[PDB]
Short mmCIF file of C-alpha atoms and ligand atoms in Angstrom, two decimals:
data_model
loop_
_atom_site.label_atom_id
_atom_site.label_comp_id
_atom_site.label_asym_id
_atom_site.label_seq_id
_atom_site.Cartn_x
_atom_site.Cartn_y
_atom_site.Cartn_z
CA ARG D 5 19.72 -26.72 -115.10
CA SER D 6 18.93 -30.47 -115.03
CA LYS D 7 17.32 -33.19 -117.12
CA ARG D 8 16.75 -35.20 -113.95
CA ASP D 9 14.74 -32.64 -112.04
CA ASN D 10 12.34 -32.33 -115.00
CA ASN D 11 11.12 -35.70 -113.63
CA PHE D 12 9.86 -34.13 -110.40
CA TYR D 13 7.38 -31.54 -109.25
CA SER D 14 6.52 -30.11 -105.84
CA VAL D 15 3.15 -29.94 -104.08
CA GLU D 16 2.47 -28.34 -100.68
CA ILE D 17 0.51 -30.25 -98.03
CA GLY D 18 0.32 -28.08 -94.91
CA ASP D 19 3.86 -27.11 -93.85
CA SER D 20 5.18 -30.27 -95.52
CA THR D 21 6.32 -30.13 -99.14
CA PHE D 22 6.26 -33.28 -101.27
CA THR D 23 8.72 -33.23 -104.21
CA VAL D 24 7.62 -36.45 -106.06
CA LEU D 25 7.93 -38.23 -109.44
CA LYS D 26 5.59 -36.61 -111.97
CA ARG D 27 3.82 -39.94 -112.43
CA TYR D 28 2.32 -39.30 -108.97
CA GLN D 29 -0.60 -36.90 -109.41
CA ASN D 30 -3.50 -35.64 -107.30
CA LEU D 31 -1.69 -35.91 -103.92
CA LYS D 32 -4.07 -35.59 -100.87
CA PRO D 33 -3.75 -35.89 -97.06
CA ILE D 34 -4.92 -39.34 -95.94
CA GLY D 35 -3.25 -39.60 -92.56
CA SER D 36 -0.51 -38.48 -90.26
CA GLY D 37 1.68 -39.66 -87.43
CA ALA D 38 4.94 -38.44 -85.88
CA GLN D 39 6.82 -38.79 -89.20
CA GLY D 40 4.38 -36.43 -90.99
CA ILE D 41 1.67 -36.78 -93.62
CA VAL D 42 0.98 -39.72 -95.89
CA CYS D 43 -0.80 -39.09 -99.21
CA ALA D 44 -3.16 -40.77 -101.61
CA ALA D 45 -2.05 -40.38 -105.20
CA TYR D 46 -2.74 -41.56 -108.68
CA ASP D 47 0.16 -43.37 -110.39
CA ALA D 48 -0.23 -42.32 -114.02
CA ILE D 49 2.01 -45.12 -115.25
CA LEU D 50 0.47 -47.90 -113.14
CA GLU D 51 -2.97 -46.29 -113.58
CA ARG D 52 -3.97 -47.06 -109.94
CA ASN D 53 -4.00 -45.40 -106.53
CA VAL D 54 -1.08 -45.53 -104.10
CA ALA D 55 -0.09 -44.28 -100.69
CA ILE D 56 3.03 -42.06 -100.51
CA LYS D 57 4.99 -41.63 -97.25
CA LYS D 58 7.87 -39.13 -96.84
CA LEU D 59 10.77 -39.67 -94.47
CA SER D 60 12.59 -36.40 -93.87
CA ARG D 61 16.27 -37.12 -93.06
CA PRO D 62 15.92 -40.77 -91.93
CA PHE D 63 19.50 -40.59 -90.63
CA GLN D 64 18.99 -37.69 -88.19
CA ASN D 65 20.09 -40.01 -85.32
CA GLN D 66 21.23 -43.61 -85.15
CA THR D 67 18.14 -45.42 -83.90
CA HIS D 68 15.95 -43.80 -86.56
CA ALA D 69 18.61 -44.62 -89.18
CA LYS D 70 18.46 -48.32 -88.20
CA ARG D 71 14.68 -48.25 -88.28
CA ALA D 72 14.57 -46.66 -91.75
CA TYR D 73 17.13 -49.06 -93.25
CA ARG D 74 15.31 -51.96 -91.58
CA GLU D 75 11.85 -50.98 -92.86
CA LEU D 76 13.32 -50.48 -96.35
CA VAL D 77 15.07 -53.83 -96.88
CA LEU D 78 12.10 -55.75 -95.34
CA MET D 79 9.28 -54.04 -97.24
CA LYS D 80 11.51 -54.69 -100.25
CA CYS D 81 11.46 -58.46 -99.65
CA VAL D 82 8.21 -59.33 -97.82
CA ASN D 83 5.34 -60.10 -100.24
CA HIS D 84 2.20 -61.09 -98.30
CA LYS D 85 -1.50 -60.21 -98.58
CA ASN D 86 -1.58 -58.95 -94.98
CA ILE D 87 1.72 -57.01 -95.07
CA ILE D 88 1.87 -53.60 -96.73
CA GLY D 89 3.74 -53.75 -100.05
CA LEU D 90 6.26 -51.21 -101.40
CA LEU D 91 5.51 -50.11 -104.99
CA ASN D 92 8.49 -47.77 -105.48
CA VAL D 93 11.00 -45.88 -103.37
CA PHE D 94 12.85 -42.79 -104.47
CA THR D 95 14.61 -39.63 -103.50
CA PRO D 96 14.41 -36.28 -105.35
CA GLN D 97 17.95 -35.24 -104.36
CA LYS D 98 20.63 -35.65 -107.05
CA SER D 99 23.54 -36.98 -104.92
CA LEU D 100 24.58 -38.19 -101.47
CA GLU D 101 26.07 -34.83 -100.42
CA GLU D 102 22.60 -33.48 -101.18
CA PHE D 103 20.65 -36.61 -100.12
CA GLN D 104 17.99 -35.76 -97.54
CA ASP D 105 14.45 -37.12 -98.09
CA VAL D 106 13.10 -40.63 -98.71
CA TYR D 107 9.70 -41.38 -100.26
CA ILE D 108 8.02 -44.81 -99.89
CA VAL D 109 5.23 -45.60 -102.39
CA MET D 110 2.95 -48.31 -101.01
CA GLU D 111 -0.49 -49.65 -101.72
CA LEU D 112 -3.44 -47.43 -100.87
CA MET D 113 -5.79 -48.50 -98.07
CA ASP D 114 -8.99 -46.94 -96.70
CA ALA D 115 -8.27 -46.26 -92.98
CA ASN D 116 -6.41 -47.71 -90.04
CA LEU D 117 -7.74 -50.10 -87.40
CA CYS D 118 -8.30 -47.36 -84.75
CA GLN D 119 -11.12 -46.17 -86.98
CA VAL D 120 -12.68 -49.65 -86.85
CA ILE D 121 -11.99 -50.45 -83.18
CA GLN D 122 -14.12 -47.52 -82.08
CA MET D 123 -16.96 -48.94 -84.26
CA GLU D 124 -19.38 -51.78 -83.55
CA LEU D 125 -18.25 -55.17 -84.93
CA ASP D 126 -19.90 -58.63 -85.15
CA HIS D 127 -17.89 -61.81 -84.54
CA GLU D 128 -17.55 -62.33 -88.28
CA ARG D 129 -15.72 -59.03 -88.76
CA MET D 130 -13.62 -59.22 -85.60
CA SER D 131 -12.46 -62.78 -86.13
CA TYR D 132 -11.84 -62.13 -89.82
CA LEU D 133 -9.65 -59.12 -89.01
CA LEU D 134 -7.69 -60.87 -86.24
CA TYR D 135 -7.19 -63.91 -88.44
CA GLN D 136 -5.66 -61.54 -90.98
CA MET D 137 -3.19 -60.12 -88.46
CA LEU D 138 -2.22 -63.64 -87.36
CA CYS D 139 -1.48 -64.43 -91.02
CA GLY D 140 0.71 -61.36 -91.31
CA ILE D 141 2.42 -61.98 -87.99
CA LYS D 142 2.99 -65.62 -88.94
CA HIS D 143 4.53 -64.59 -92.26
CA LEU D 144 7.00 -62.29 -90.45
CA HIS D 145 8.00 -65.00 -87.94
CA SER D 146 8.78 -67.48 -90.78
CA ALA D 147 11.66 -65.20 -91.79
CA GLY D 148 12.72 -64.53 -88.19
CA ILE D 149 11.09 -61.09 -87.73
CA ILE D 150 9.52 -60.62 -84.29
CA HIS D 151 7.46 -57.42 -84.51
CA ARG D 152 7.35 -56.72 -80.72
CA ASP D 153 5.12 -53.66 -81.13
CA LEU D 154 1.92 -54.06 -83.18
CA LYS D 155 -0.58 -51.30 -82.61
CA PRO D 156 -3.97 -50.46 -84.19
CA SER D 157 -2.65 -47.23 -85.69
CA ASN D 158 -0.02 -49.01 -87.75
CA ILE D 159 -2.44 -51.48 -89.24
CA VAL D 160 -4.69 -50.47 -92.10
CA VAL D 161 -7.88 -52.11 -93.37
CA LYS D 162 -9.96 -51.69 -96.46
CA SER D 163 -13.74 -51.45 -96.94
CA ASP D 164 -13.94 -55.09 -98.11
CA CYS D 165 -12.48 -55.78 -94.60
CA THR D 166 -8.97 -56.71 -95.74
CA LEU D 167 -6.05 -55.84 -93.52
CA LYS D 168 -2.38 -55.03 -93.93
CA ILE D 169 0.17 -54.44 -91.20
CA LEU D 170 2.13 -51.27 -91.91
CA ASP D 171 5.47 -51.66 -90.03
CA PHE D 172 7.94 -54.37 -88.96
CA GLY D 173 8.55 -53.32 -85.37
CA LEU D 174 11.70 -52.68 -83.37
CA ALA D 175 15.28 -53.80 -84.06
CA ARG D 176 16.66 -56.54 -81.77
CA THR D 177 17.78 -55.50 -78.28
CA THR D 190 3.18 -45.24 -75.21
CA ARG D 191 3.60 -48.93 -74.24
CA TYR D 192 -0.11 -49.96 -74.48
CA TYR D 193 0.38 -53.06 -76.73
CA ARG D 194 3.81 -53.94 -75.39
CA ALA D 195 4.09 -57.40 -73.83
CA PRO D 196 5.35 -57.79 -70.23
CA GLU D 197 8.42 -59.65 -71.47
CA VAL D 198 9.73 -56.60 -73.33
CA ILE D 199 8.52 -53.89 -70.92
CA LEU D 200 10.44 -55.70 -68.14
CA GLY D 201 13.60 -56.44 -70.15
CA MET D 202 13.54 -60.22 -70.16
CA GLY D 203 14.25 -62.21 -73.26
CA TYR D 204 11.43 -62.60 -75.74
CA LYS D 205 10.25 -65.12 -78.32
CA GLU D 206 7.93 -65.14 -81.32
CA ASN D 207 4.82 -65.15 -79.19
CA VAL D 208 5.68 -61.72 -77.72
CA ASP D 209 3.38 -60.56 -80.56
CA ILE D 210 0.45 -62.71 -79.39
CA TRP D 211 0.10 -60.38 -76.40
CA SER D 212 -0.55 -57.46 -78.81
CA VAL D 213 -3.19 -59.28 -80.79
CA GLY D 214 -4.67 -59.88 -77.35
CA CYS D 215 -4.80 -56.18 -76.53
CA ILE D 216 -6.28 -55.34 -79.89
CA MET D 217 -8.84 -58.13 -79.68
CA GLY D 218 -9.69 -57.00 -76.17
CA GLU D 219 -9.80 -53.44 -77.47
CA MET D 220 -12.27 -54.37 -80.21
CA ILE D 221 -14.61 -56.06 -77.69
CA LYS D 222 -14.50 -53.58 -74.80
CA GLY D 223 -14.47 -50.41 -76.96
CA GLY D 224 -11.38 -48.58 -75.65
CA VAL D 225 -7.73 -49.04 -74.69
CA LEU D 226 -7.33 -51.89 -72.18
CA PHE D 227 -4.11 -50.90 -70.42
CA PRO D 228 -3.50 -47.16 -71.13
CA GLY D 229 -0.52 -46.47 -68.86
CA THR D 230 0.60 -42.90 -68.15
CA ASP D 231 4.19 -43.88 -67.29
CA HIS D 232 6.38 -46.95 -67.46
CA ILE D 233 5.26 -47.71 -63.88
CA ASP D 234 1.55 -47.09 -64.53
CA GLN D 235 1.71 -49.39 -67.58
CA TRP D 236 2.79 -52.40 -65.51
CA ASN D 237 0.36 -51.60 -62.67
CA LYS D 238 -2.66 -51.17 -64.96
CA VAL D 239 -1.84 -54.63 -66.36
CA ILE D 240 -1.65 -56.42 -62.99
CA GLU D 241 -4.83 -54.88 -61.58
CA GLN D 242 -6.79 -56.61 -64.32
CA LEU D 243 -4.74 -59.76 -64.83
CA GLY D 244 -3.37 -60.19 -61.26
CA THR D 245 0.28 -60.29 -60.08
CA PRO D 246 2.25 -63.05 -61.89
CA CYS D 247 3.43 -66.30 -60.36
CA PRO D 248 6.63 -66.85 -58.35
CA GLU D 249 7.81 -69.35 -60.95
CA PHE D 250 7.74 -66.53 -63.56
CA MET D 251 10.29 -64.28 -61.77
CA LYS D 252 13.24 -64.50 -64.22
CA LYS D 253 15.66 -62.18 -66.11
CA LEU D 254 17.56 -59.72 -63.88
CA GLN D 255 17.59 -60.26 -60.08
CA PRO D 256 17.54 -56.47 -59.44
CA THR D 257 14.21 -56.41 -61.31
CA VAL D 258 13.09 -59.46 -59.24
CA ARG D 259 12.69 -57.38 -56.08
CA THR D 260 12.05 -54.17 -58.06
CA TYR D 261 8.46 -52.83 -58.08
CA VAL D 262 7.15 -56.36 -57.62
CA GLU D 263 7.86 -58.44 -54.52
CA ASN D 264 6.05 -55.97 -52.26
CA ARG D 265 4.17 -54.04 -54.93
CA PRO D 266 0.64 -54.22 -53.46
CA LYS D 267 -0.52 -57.78 -54.12
CA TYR D 268 -3.11 -58.04 -56.90
CA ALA D 269 -5.44 -60.90 -57.78
CA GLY D 270 -6.95 -60.18 -61.16
CA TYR D 271 -10.59 -60.48 -62.12
CA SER D 272 -12.07 -63.35 -64.11
CA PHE D 273 -12.43 -63.01 -67.87
CA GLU D 274 -16.16 -63.50 -67.41
CA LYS D 275 -15.78 -60.32 -65.33
CA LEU D 276 -13.23 -58.51 -67.60
CA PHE D 277 -15.23 -59.10 -70.82
CA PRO D 278 -18.87 -59.57 -69.73
CA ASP D 279 -21.63 -60.66 -72.09
CA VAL D 280 -22.67 -56.98 -72.14
CA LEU D 281 -19.76 -56.31 -74.52
CA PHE D 282 -20.84 -59.12 -76.96
CA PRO D 283 -24.24 -59.56 -78.66
CA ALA D 284 -26.28 -62.55 -77.34
CA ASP D 285 -28.33 -62.50 -80.54
CA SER D 286 -28.53 -66.27 -81.14
CA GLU D 287 -27.12 -69.53 -79.92
CA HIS D 288 -24.39 -68.87 -82.50
CA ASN D 289 -23.56 -65.53 -80.87
CA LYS D 290 -23.64 -67.12 -77.38
CA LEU D 291 -21.14 -69.66 -78.71
CA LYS D 292 -18.89 -67.02 -80.32
CA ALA D 293 -18.85 -64.86 -77.19
CA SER D 294 -17.76 -67.94 -75.22
CA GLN D 295 -15.03 -68.91 -77.75
CA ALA D 296 -13.61 -65.35 -78.04
CA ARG D 297 -13.42 -64.80 -74.29
CA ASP D 298 -11.56 -68.11 -74.18
CA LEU D 299 -9.09 -67.05 -76.88
CA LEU D 300 -8.39 -63.86 -74.88
CA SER D 301 -7.82 -65.97 -71.79
CA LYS D 302 -4.89 -67.55 -73.68
CA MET D 303 -3.30 -64.43 -75.20
CA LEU D 304 -3.69 -62.00 -72.30
CA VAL D 305 -1.42 -64.03 -70.03
CA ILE D 306 1.65 -62.46 -68.40
CA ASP D 307 3.88 -65.59 -68.31
CA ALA D 308 4.85 -66.48 -71.90
CA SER D 309 5.43 -70.06 -70.77
CA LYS D 310 1.62 -70.15 -70.56
CA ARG D 311 0.82 -67.88 -73.56
CA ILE D 312 -0.57 -69.32 -76.74
CA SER D 313 1.45 -69.63 -79.92
CA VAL D 314 0.56 -67.90 -83.18
CA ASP D 315 0.01 -71.28 -84.86
CA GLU D 316 -2.25 -72.40 -82.01
CA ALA D 317 -4.18 -69.11 -82.11
CA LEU D 318 -4.72 -69.61 -85.87
CA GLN D 319 -6.17 -73.09 -85.15
CA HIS D 320 -8.49 -71.69 -82.48
CA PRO D 321 -12.28 -72.20 -82.78
CA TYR D 322 -12.90 -68.42 -82.80
CA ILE D 323 -10.35 -67.95 -85.58
CA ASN D 324 -10.09 -71.15 -87.64
CA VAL D 325 -13.40 -70.65 -89.43
CA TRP D 326 -11.36 -68.73 -92.06
CA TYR D 327 -8.48 -71.19 -92.43
CA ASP D 328 -7.11 -71.69 -95.94
CA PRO D 329 -3.60 -72.83 -97.01
CA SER D 330 -3.22 -70.05 -99.67
CA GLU D 331 -2.51 -67.28 -97.14
CA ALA D 332 -1.57 -69.35 -94.06
CA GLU D 333 1.32 -71.18 -95.81
CA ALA D 334 3.05 -68.55 -97.99
CA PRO D 335 6.68 -68.69 -99.32
CA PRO D 336 8.83 -67.17 -96.59
CA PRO D 337 10.71 -63.93 -97.29
CA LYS D 338 14.33 -63.84 -98.39
CA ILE D 339 15.93 -61.09 -96.30
CA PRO D 340 19.13 -60.31 -98.26
CA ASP D 341 20.96 -58.86 -95.19
CA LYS D 342 21.45 -61.10 -92.14
CA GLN D 343 23.30 -58.77 -89.75
CA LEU D 344 20.44 -56.26 -90.45
CA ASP D 345 19.33 -56.38 -86.78
CA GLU D 346 22.92 -56.12 -85.52
CA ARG D 347 24.57 -53.58 -87.82
CA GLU D 348 25.89 -50.55 -85.89
CA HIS D 349 27.20 -47.54 -87.87
CA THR D 350 27.88 -43.83 -87.67
CA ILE D 351 25.36 -41.33 -89.01
CA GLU D 352 27.46 -40.89 -92.16
CA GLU D 353 27.61 -44.65 -92.75
CA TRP D 354 23.84 -44.96 -92.25
CA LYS D 355 23.26 -42.06 -94.68
CA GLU D 356 25.24 -43.73 -97.50
CA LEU D 357 23.73 -47.05 -96.37
CA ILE D 358 20.19 -45.71 -96.74
CA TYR D 359 21.06 -43.82 -99.92
CA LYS D 360 22.18 -46.77 -102.04
CA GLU D 361 19.10 -48.67 -100.84
CA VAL D 362 16.96 -45.96 -102.49
CA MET D 363 19.25 -45.86 -105.57
CA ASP D 364 19.54 -49.44 -106.89
CA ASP G 4 -8.99 -81.07 -111.87
CA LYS G 5 -10.41 -78.69 -109.19
CA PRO G 6 -14.18 -78.38 -109.90
CA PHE G 7 -15.60 -75.95 -107.28
CA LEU G 8 -15.20 -72.36 -108.55
CA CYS G 9 -15.59 -68.93 -106.95
CA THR G 10 -17.52 -66.50 -109.13
CA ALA G 11 -16.10 -63.17 -107.91
CA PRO G 12 -15.06 -60.78 -110.70
CA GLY G 13 -11.28 -60.90 -111.02
CA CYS G 14 -10.86 -64.08 -108.93
CA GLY G 15 -10.45 -67.32 -110.80
CA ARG G 16 -9.98 -69.23 -107.60
CA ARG G 17 -11.07 -72.84 -107.42
CA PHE G 18 -11.70 -75.22 -104.56
CA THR G 19 -11.60 -79.00 -104.40
CA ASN G 20 -13.84 -78.94 -101.27
CA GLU G 21 -17.39 -77.60 -100.97
CA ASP G 22 -16.97 -76.19 -97.46
CA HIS G 23 -13.66 -74.55 -98.36
CA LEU G 24 -15.35 -72.54 -101.15
CA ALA G 25 -18.09 -71.56 -98.69
CA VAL G 26 -15.80 -69.50 -96.49
CA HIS G 27 -14.05 -68.10 -99.58
CA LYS G 28 -17.31 -66.69 -100.98
CA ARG G 29 -18.18 -65.29 -97.53
CA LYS G 30 -14.78 -63.57 -97.48
CA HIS G 31 -15.62 -61.64 -100.69
CA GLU G 32 -18.96 -60.57 -99.18
CA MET G 33 -17.46 -58.83 -96.15
CA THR G 34 -17.41 -55.06 -95.60
CA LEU G 35 -16.62 -52.70 -92.73
CA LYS G 36 -17.38 -49.06 -92.03
CA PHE G 37 -15.17 -46.56 -90.23
CA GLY G 38 -14.99 -42.99 -89.06
CA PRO G 39 -11.84 -40.87 -89.55
N1 ANP A 1 -0.42 -47.28 -97.11
C1 ANP A 1 -1.33 -46.60 -96.40
N2 ANP A 1 -2.64 -46.64 -96.79
C2 ANP A 1 -3.54 -45.96 -96.07
N3 ANP A 1 -3.34 -45.20 -94.98
C3 ANP A 1 -2.05 -45.15 -94.64
C4 ANP A 1 -0.99 -45.80 -95.29
N4 ANP A 1 0.20 -45.54 -94.63
C5 ANP A 1 -0.13 -44.78 -93.62
N5 ANP A 1 -1.47 -44.49 -93.58
C6 ANP A 1 -2.14 -43.66 -92.56
O1 ANP A 1 -1.27 -42.60 -92.16
C7 ANP A 1 -0.87 -42.78 -90.78
C8 ANP A 1 0.61 -42.58 -90.68
O2 ANP A 1 1.24 -43.79 -91.22
P1 ANP A 1 2.47 -44.26 -90.49
O3 ANP A 1 3.17 -44.97 -91.51
O4 ANP A 1 2.14 -44.95 -89.18
O5 ANP A 1 3.22 -42.98 -90.06
P2 ANP A 1 3.91 -42.84 -88.66
O6 ANP A 1 3.02 -43.28 -87.53
O7 ANP A 1 4.30 -41.38 -88.44
N6 ANP A 1 5.37 -43.60 -88.68
P3 ANP A 1 5.46 -44.97 -87.70
O8 ANP A 1 6.07 -44.57 -86.40
O9 ANP A 1 6.33 -45.95 -88.56
O10 ANP A 1 4.03 -45.59 -87.37
C9 ANP A 1 -1.28 -44.21 -90.41
O11 ANP A 1 -1.60 -44.30 -89.03
C10 ANP A 1 -2.49 -44.45 -91.31
O12 ANP A 1 -3.67 -43.96 -90.70
MG1 MG A 2 2.71 -44.98 -86.22
MG1 MG A 3 7.75 -46.99 -89.42
ZN1 ZN A 4 -12.82 -65.56 -105.08
#
């Protein structure tokens, strides 16, 4: 039938079928999420390993369509050591009437951060990892991209302890790493993301999810029990929300951070470990703060004693990305427009 | 004109400062273990 489909073959992984470029051999399950399986493969042309992620009908609805087009143009134009890089993107379907599936070829990593967070970690690993996220987060903010939803399962690390953030977050508009300012519908700024480094840092020290909220109501309550009800000066955004679930929600005074993260959680091996426990618990104190007025900046967190041991201009001052589309966060189309919009992104 | 050199295979990176190379070599030496 076709010269062009002699360039593809099909491999079955569970119920999923991957129809990929024949350069990609030895496909194998290496992880899964709600969008399906991701595979390890060998690129016979590049003679290296890769990760391959399939998006089945990225334009099924409009919010997914915006998220697919957004993750495509940005991965196309963000080149940073701590951001996952796109190696190729393709579709096996021969035209837009037939266009259905999108395959993203990215670099191959060893695991995600959930598989490290459950582990035991010394200050040198923890601070090195967090420093790496702050470098990735800082690179995104240079170009105007506020992640707003970093989570340990969408960050991958490698056995030499390097780290790459997988996604770019939500388009402008389980909540366990979501900052108060976006779970309560205020405005947000770049340091919205500092809150989420805070929950991951806290997660690494304590050993399990800090604020695992069952609902959208339990997620705010389980924050204030530990951190205490916020200040009257903080009550902004909508006035309906001002009274709502707050003014008489049972008053909470949080616990101290000496009490939230006791020296039990850290190793008091040396004087050096006594000093690093102290510094880290102080860094938390500045990221796990409800009022963003009083929350640290990314640049300040990168110059923090716990974190600035690793400082080097190479990765902390990179050349900012050149996002070709500016309305990217504000485009609003129909499913058919998104489809052709996503298609010619795959096809140029 | 940058005398202090990292010796890692595949890294030709050079440092003008002694301390700055120190953390760079330590960065190559790191590892972590995980469970799927
Ligand atoms: N490039 C990669 N290298 C190594 N492991 C990866 C890679 N991409 C994904 N994984 C693993 O596969 C899982 C699924 O990846 P992910 O891209 O998060 O899919 P997803 O969760 O369904 N979609 P999303 O909602 O964007 O997070 C991740 O949590 C990782 O554990
Ligand atoms: Mg995910
Ligand atoms: Mg995604
Ligand atoms: Zn080196």
